[PDB]
Amino acid sequence: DNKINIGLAVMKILESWGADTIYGIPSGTLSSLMDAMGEEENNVKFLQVKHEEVGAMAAVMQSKFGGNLGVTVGSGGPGASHLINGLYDAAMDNIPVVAILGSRPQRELNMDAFQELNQNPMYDHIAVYNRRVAYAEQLPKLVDEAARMAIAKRGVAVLEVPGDFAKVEIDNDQWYSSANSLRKYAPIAPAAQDIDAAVELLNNSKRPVIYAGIGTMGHGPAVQELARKIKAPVITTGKNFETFEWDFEALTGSTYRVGWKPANETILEADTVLFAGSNFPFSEVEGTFRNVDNFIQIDIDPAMLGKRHHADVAILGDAALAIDEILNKVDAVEESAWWTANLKNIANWREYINMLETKEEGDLQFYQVYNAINNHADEDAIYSIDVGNSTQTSIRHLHMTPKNMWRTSPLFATMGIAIPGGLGAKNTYPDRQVWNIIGDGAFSMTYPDVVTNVRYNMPVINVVFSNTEYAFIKNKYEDTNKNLFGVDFTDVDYAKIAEAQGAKGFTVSRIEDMDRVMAEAVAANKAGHTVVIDCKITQDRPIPVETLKLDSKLYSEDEIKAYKERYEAANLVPFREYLEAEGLESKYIK
Amino acid sequence: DNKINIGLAVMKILESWGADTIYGIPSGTLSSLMDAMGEEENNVKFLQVKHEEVGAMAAVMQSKFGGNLGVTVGSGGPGASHLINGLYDAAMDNIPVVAILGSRPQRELNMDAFQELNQNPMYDHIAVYNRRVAYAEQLPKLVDEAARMAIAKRGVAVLEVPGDFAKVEIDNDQWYSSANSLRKYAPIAPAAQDIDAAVELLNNSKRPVIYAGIGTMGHGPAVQELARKIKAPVITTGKNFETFEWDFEALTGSTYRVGWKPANETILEADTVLFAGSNFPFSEVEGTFRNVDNFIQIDIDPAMLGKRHHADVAILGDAALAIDEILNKVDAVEESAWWTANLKNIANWREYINMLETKEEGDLQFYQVYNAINNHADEDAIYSIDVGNSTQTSIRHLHMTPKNMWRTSPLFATMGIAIPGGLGAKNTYPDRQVWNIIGDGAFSMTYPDVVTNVRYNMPVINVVFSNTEYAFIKNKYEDTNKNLFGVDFTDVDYAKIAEAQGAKGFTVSRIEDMDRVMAEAVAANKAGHTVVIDCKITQDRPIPVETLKLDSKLYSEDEIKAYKERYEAANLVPFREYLEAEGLESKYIK
Amino acid sequence: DNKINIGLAVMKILESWGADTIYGIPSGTLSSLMDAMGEEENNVKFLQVKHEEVGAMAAVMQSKFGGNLGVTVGSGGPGASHLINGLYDAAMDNIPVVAILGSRPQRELNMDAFQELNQNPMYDHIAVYNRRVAYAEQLPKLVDEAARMAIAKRGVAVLEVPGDFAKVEIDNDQWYSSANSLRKYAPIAPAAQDIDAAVELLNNSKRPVIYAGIGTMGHGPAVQELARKIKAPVITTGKNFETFEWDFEALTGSTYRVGWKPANETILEADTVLFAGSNFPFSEVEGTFRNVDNFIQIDIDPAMLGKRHHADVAILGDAALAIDEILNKVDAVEESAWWTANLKNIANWREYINMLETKEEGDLQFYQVYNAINNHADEDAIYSIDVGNSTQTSIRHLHMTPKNMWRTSPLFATMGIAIPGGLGAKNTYPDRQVWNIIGDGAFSMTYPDVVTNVRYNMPVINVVFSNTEYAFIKNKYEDTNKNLFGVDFTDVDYAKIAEAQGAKGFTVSRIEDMDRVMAEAVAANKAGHTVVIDCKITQDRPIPVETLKLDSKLYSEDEIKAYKERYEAANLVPFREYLEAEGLESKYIK
Numbered sequence A, B, C: 001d002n003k004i005n006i007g008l009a010v011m012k013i014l015e016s017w018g019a020d021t022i023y024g025i026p027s028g029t030l031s032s033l034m035d036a037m038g039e040e041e042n043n044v045k046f047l048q049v050k051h052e053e054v055g056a057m058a059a060v061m062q063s064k065f066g067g068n069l070g071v072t073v074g075s076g077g078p079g080a081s082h083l084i085n086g087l088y089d090a091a092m093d094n095i096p097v098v099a100i101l102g103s104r105p106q107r108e109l110n111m112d113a114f115q116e117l118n119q120n121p122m123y124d125h126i127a128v129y130n131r132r133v134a135y136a137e138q139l140p141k142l143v144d145e146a147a148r149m150a151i152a153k154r155g156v157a158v159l160e161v162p163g164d165f166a167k168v169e170i171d172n173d174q175w176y177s178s179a180n181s182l183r184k185y186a187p188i189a190p191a192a193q194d195i196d197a198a199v200e201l202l203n204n205s206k207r208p209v210i211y212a213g214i215g216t217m218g219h220g221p222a223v224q225e226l227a228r229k230i231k232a233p234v235i236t237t238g239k240n241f242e243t244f245e246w247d248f249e250a251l252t253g254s255t256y257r258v259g260w261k262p263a264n265e266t267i268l269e270a271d272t273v274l275f276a277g278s279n280f281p282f283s284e285v286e287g288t289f290r291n292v293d294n295f296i297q298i299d300i301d302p303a304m305l306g307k308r309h310h311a312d313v314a315i316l317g318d319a320a321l322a323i324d325e326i327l328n329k330v331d332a333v334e335e336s337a338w339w340t341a342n343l344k345n346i347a348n349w350r351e352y353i354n355m356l357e358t359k360e361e362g363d364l365q366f367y368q369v370y371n372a373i374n375n376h377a378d379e380d381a382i383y384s385i386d387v388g389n390s391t392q393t394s395i396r397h398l399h400m401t402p403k404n405m406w407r408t409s410p411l412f413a414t415m416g417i418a419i420p421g422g423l424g425a426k427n428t429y430p431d432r433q434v435w436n437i438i439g440d441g442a443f444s445m446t447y448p449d450v451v452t453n454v455r456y457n458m459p460v461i462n463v464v465f466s467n468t469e470y471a472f473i474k475n476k477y478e479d480t481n482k483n484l485f486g487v488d489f490t491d492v493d494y495a496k497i498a499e500a501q502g503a504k505g506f507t508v509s510r511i512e513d514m515d516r517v518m519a520e521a522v523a524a525n526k527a528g529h530t531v532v533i534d535c536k537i538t539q540d541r542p543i544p545v546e547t548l549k550l551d552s553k554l555y556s557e558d559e560i561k562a563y564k565e566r567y568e569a570a571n572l573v574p575f576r577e578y579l580e581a582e583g584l585e586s587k588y589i590k
């Protein structure tokens, strides 16, 4: 032993924590650190992006997709501030990530020098750790603790690092990594008393429903078995569709806007809700559970117990173990009018969606684009979804199973999350098929980074929806506003831009050309090319399932007529009809 | 059912969470809320203090002493800002507490009105929850969540509440409490693989030492049994003395300044350290573990694993269970030179302390005041200790056991924590003997609140050390400075002030009068009186155990001579002598 | 030249800026700096307080009273946080002040060491400068800039200083003071076009009124001359009474609660308002100007123009110059019914106040305490007023002139501002009579610092109002609440406490004893003693002039009867009567 460069010590620490990829853009305030990358057999790699926000989002999405702890860097000042959308997303999603903010050298601090400023206030509100390194020798210790904190506190750990520190040398015995001491709690078994109370309520309920969030990830088969055992339909969240087999007989979808018709009707007619591993944000403001009688909640976070609705039964512990315990103790239900009515309601919805997806000719709609994806995607495909209307509606069409991964920016909802997500995913799974589904608005905030996929040979399939408008925003102008719309722009040739970036571009605007174009796009991706499919679609909006104008006791004939005509929903049948057909009555309608 | 006042709903929620005591000062920006207190059979009580900081600290100390969740209020502006020292203490100690900041009515917000301001920035840095209520109807929900968060996140939950909101009425079905869903994780068993690794290291160590922090609270007997089984001396932290029987043969005390001579010598000679449930803050900066060979850590917080020193073995889980598992698996050690040497070193230290405590006549020193306390205190006495030098040194004298509770402001170290601590303690244990041990400086920041104990008939014994100087500060002027001192003030008659406040005052300055005065003070307290014992002591400083000038191989004869003379330590023997007497050699000296 | 200690360099810089007094409490994290005080012929002195908040408030009040730039220090952690109320007051009042936050040495930063923490977030929201010194050598530069910024930006400049920096030595040519370059703008003349527009409106107004704030400080004689010239009554603000001769024929007082009856009636009947140098905070929320027709504003701050009400005429520049220009150009008014009616209304109010102040026997009321002060105070007496109801009402009784200074915490309104104010005032004017007028609640938050006046031989007269209740708070429980009150405490002997602190205490509870007690108190103060007059007054509340129940067209006979009986206001006459007597009619009543 002898001496070691502080920058190298930092890289050794990062590698010990599994943080082998740093995302960002090189700069003078970060050079000393980056210069240590590699050599001494270090395995930390640098992935250079075009905009630091994409680097931050990529580092975060890497973890969302099950990858290693990500690290993102931003040069002192503007580079650091550019990380904001990625860090806010991580903070709200409780995703570990280490953000390193470069800074002018120590001697320049507080001198009002060029691009010199106090960056401590920048992320203090959202960070789980936020410190300005005070002297070179403690940099290794703080990077180690930043990783430890990001992981333990499930959030953003931020370090402001003066650019001269990494150049300093220290004794090899003056630093260490605590990665070897990394420990995590194994799934914890729920209290028998709480499981028992839940079992009693479920046994005595006439209309049970399972509302499963990502806390049930990895336990879809068990949840489906419980659903079948007690004849309780399943409602999922916008983040948890992959947990279920897309064609599961009792899957009603999700509630509210980015949801399905069945789920939205089921929740208003349910009696007992098993809220498993969810923190559904629309709960209170949209009155999701306004008609429920009993509410059972399962969660590993005590801060969540009884948060979204009063909980008659609270179960603290792992959702897997809890579901298994409930499954073993609850009584089996052979026949149920409630179950039968729900199955028919779901089937009716699937008929509608299938009809839209399988059209043969005409102006392209996003429905058929999703159909093409289903017909050509690998069974274990990864989906990086952006936040627009046409992209979030993907959960109504993608035929996913737990073999897939579907991730977005679900709560903070930052636009432009797709491309960075694709980078994080492909970096983690180089041999796996990765799709980025993006709307024109979101694409326009991040398409310069398509070149990043090209440069690093991380081939992804970019599916871009171009409608010259904004469906999502076109939905918030007919529910609170009164004046005319106004969200129509020009016609940018994204395929041409892709070609200019070294990617392969395709343009499609007809349903009859979609299958061929998708096949060619997939084949090109398999040849190692990043592709951009510019889908010139119509201005059609996904049917608003939060405002179902189908029940003749809730809306007028004219309203139902116009609703059916606009969304091609002539064959959709209101849930009450299915309930009454099985001898039941609506608990709230009339 | 029908309607309910929002303020009353808030009180019902607080009571459901066990928060039956609100500390603060009445004001117009808090009146609507306080007006709901009581009535409708509500049991929430208000304890009015003289300075809001005492209310905040009292609410926090209430929890430190094992009481219910505390609530502290501060009027918009100055009342709210006055809570700062109490909230910072809670934040750093990870103590749950709900702080309600009053505010001018909604209509005045952002108008630059009188005593109107944005208070959201005030505590955002330290809070686990920090929100400004946006409308009256959600106040109940936010107070409920504030309690849930404070407890779940072990910290400060802050709510800024416009003064007009509590006056509003809502439907009784428009609010609920999630207190019924409160759940906490039971002690979690450690991984067998980690316990086994620890057992191997302890079995093969020639000089094992147990360093126990408050994570071992409630398991002192087991820790003492392990110490005896493997012949490993025990070192404790400044916060964890009550966990051990004060006279335990192998208790070496704590390290650094507020510690004992034995512990400070033991840690520099130890080979293997079992760091159980501690986050000792002096670890790195004072090089506490600079000579240790192996380090084993037990903690329930993964963020702490390997934080204070590289951990060769990391055990995640409850300290109780871990200690029990280690105790059952480790080999018993019959004889140990290391153990024998430590026992003699401890005995030598106890001879010194006993000699100081048992003096019969002369100018009063804090040593004899502590002696008097030991001779008259109840076996289950509660001690609220302030942060000065003469008060923290109490851990060298108080003969405590797990039947006692000793609490202070250990990390943030805010002065004036004693009186508030006494309030929180007496509020929780009305029939228990409570002592506030305070230095003149700290007392001077909080003595107006002695009247609070008087007014609410919460009798406590205030022991005040008056030396016209500041021992603690008189220690940081001979280790980094060079110029003369200068910390001598006047002679305020605290006994007279106490009498003026309705309390009983005593003044003592001679060792031969101490026992009688203490007896009278205790008897007065048992008659329901709050007492203030103004102890006029000498300027003697507690022997500096962080700089032991006793070993002739570490310091010169003249230094050792002067050291022994100044601290009356002629009979103290350096640990190396005891080591060599048992056939061992110092691992670092020479 | 050669070398110099950084701490000494800092003191030389402070002295060059006139900052010769540092307020605070000594501590290890501040010792290196304080050790440099004095020697090398430096004139910076240290004034040690009992609670750091008093040190902060004293440093701030020093400037409010026309003294030099104040400096306040707070030890790392709790000492620093204790400064908050003083700093918020300075921030809201736009008063320059330098706050130095001590900190653990550089090597301990970010190590989670004892009493070690990031203090940058603490005051970032309110500071005009807030930096953590990055290395020793730049400390002098930053202290110099802190002073420059505090003064130039009229606010709080904060520096966090690691305790090891001041010990470092630098070359004497490596530091400098920019105090020699201190420059301030002289009064700026207003635009002739704006003065002319104002002159036209005033000339054509039938009911002009001058509303003067502290922007008119130093120009009272001119304002009174303008009032007489155009026959426009004068309304002042709670901060600006000293600007006028207390007995000025046309002084109506101030509006709202801490005001007089005349002003409150005048503003609702006025047509044109000359709003000179004011930022009256109650303007919008209390509808102060709801009946005004024209509004003219004069201010040196463009941010204030049109802030409190739409401005028909805006004058940017010095109030003195503007008043002089208006005075020279406006037409003289010989007779005015509006003026005559106002003079009678004012006289009627003065009859009432005089009657209360001159009672001869009975239970003491604050009215007679103020009478005694008027009869014994020096013509140039300085008044440090706290924020309670009985103390703010002093503007209804004190017979002040520009020779006096009256200061409080007017906007942030922190309780306990009086004692610190007295310290700042006496430090600045050692040979001047200084009075601290305090309510029992405020006194209880700061009385331990009475000893500070004693210790430093800065004799002040503390007048304490003890009513066992809280008048102010007793006013916000009968305008928004509904339930019973509840603000009665014990009876603390403040005179006895004062004696215990080395001060001279007096107790008085009868009107017939007030003059003698005051005479003795003043004589004692002239003998160099700090005094505390414990005035045991009744629970009588100052008449609520914001809710004048006197006009038979605004309130019922029973209401007027009860109002007159409760406040001994049988002889008060509603302004409308005086208006009609002069041939005028109310513009809003009926």
Ligand SMILES: Cc1cc2nc3c(=O)[nH]c(=O)nc-3n(C[C@H](O)[C@H](O)[C@H](O)COP(=O)(O)OP(=O)(O)OC[C@H]3O[C@@H](n4cnc5c(N)ncnc54)[C@H](O)[C@@H]3O)c2cc1C
Residues within 6 Å of the ligand: A212, A213, A214, A215, A216, A236, A237, A238, A239, A240, A254, A255, A256, A257, A258, A259, A276, A277, A278, A279, A280, A281, A298, A299, A300, A301, A304, A317, A318, A319, A320, A387, A388, A392, A408, A409, A410, A411, A412, A413
């Ligand atoms: C534009 C846009 C529109 C959207 N529209 C909708 C919509 O209409 N409908 C919809 O549903 N969503 C929608 N979303 C997504 C939505 O905002 C939420 O992010 C999502 O519903 C949250 O899902 P969740 O409850 O599964 O998980 P989270 O909110 O992440 O909460 C998961 C919960 O599971 C708990 N948990 C974790 N692990 C375990 C375990 N092992 N055992 C037990 N509990 C565990 C956690 O503590 C947590 O409480 C939309 C998002 C965007 C960006």
Ligand SMILES: Cc1cc2nc3c(=O)[nH]c(=O)nc-3n(C[C@H](O)[C@H](O)[C@H](O)COP(=O)(O)OP(=O)(O)OC[C@H]3O[C@@H](n4cnc5c(N)ncnc54)[C@H](O)[C@@H]3O)c2cc1C
Residues within 6 Å of the ligand: B212, B213, B214, B215, B216, B236, B237, B238, B239, B240, B254, B255, B256, B257, B258, B259, B276, B277, B278, B279, B280, B281, B298, B299, B300, B301, B304, B317, B318, B319, B320, B387, B388, B392, B408, B409, B410, B411, B412, B413, C114
């Ligand atoms: C003026 C002053 C001087 C001081 N001087 C000294 C001094 O000289 N020496 C000294 O030792 N102290 C001193 N202190 C106190 C010192 O600052 C620390 O607060 C104290 O040592 C921390 O003790 P701790 O490690 O027991 O607990 P904490 O710092 O509170 O840490 C406890 C640890 O236990 C873990 N834990 C909690 N529950 C469990 C469980 N069930 N199982 C396992 N782990 C668990 C926690 O996660 C945490 O990591 C002083 C304080 C003041 C104010």
Ligand SMILES: Cc1cc2nc3c(=O)[nH]c(=O)nc-3n(C[C@H](O)[C@H](O)[C@H](O)COP(=O)(O)OP(=O)(O)OC[C@H]3O[C@@H](n4cnc5c(N)ncnc54)[C@H](O)[C@@H]3O)c2cc1C
Residues within 6 Å of the ligand: B114, C212, C213, C214, C215, C216, C236, C237, C238, C239, C240, C254, C255, C256, C257, C258, C259, C276, C277, C278, C279, C280, C281, C298, C299, C300, C301, C304, C317, C318, C319, C320, C387, C388, C392, C408, C409, C410, C411, C412, C413
């Ligand atoms: C408990 C309590 C109760 C109170 N009750 C009342 C009450 O009932 N009534 C009341 O009136 N006050 C009351 N106050 C005081 C009140 O809150 C305000 O602080 C005060 O009225 C502000 O007075 P101001 O407008 O003179 O000065 P400021 O608010 O300080 O504004 C002065 C203005 O003058 C300008 N200025 C400065 N220098 C010049 C110059 N040379 N030329 C031109 N313009 C200049 C400034 O830019 C500024 O806009 C109370 C305070 C407390 C603590």
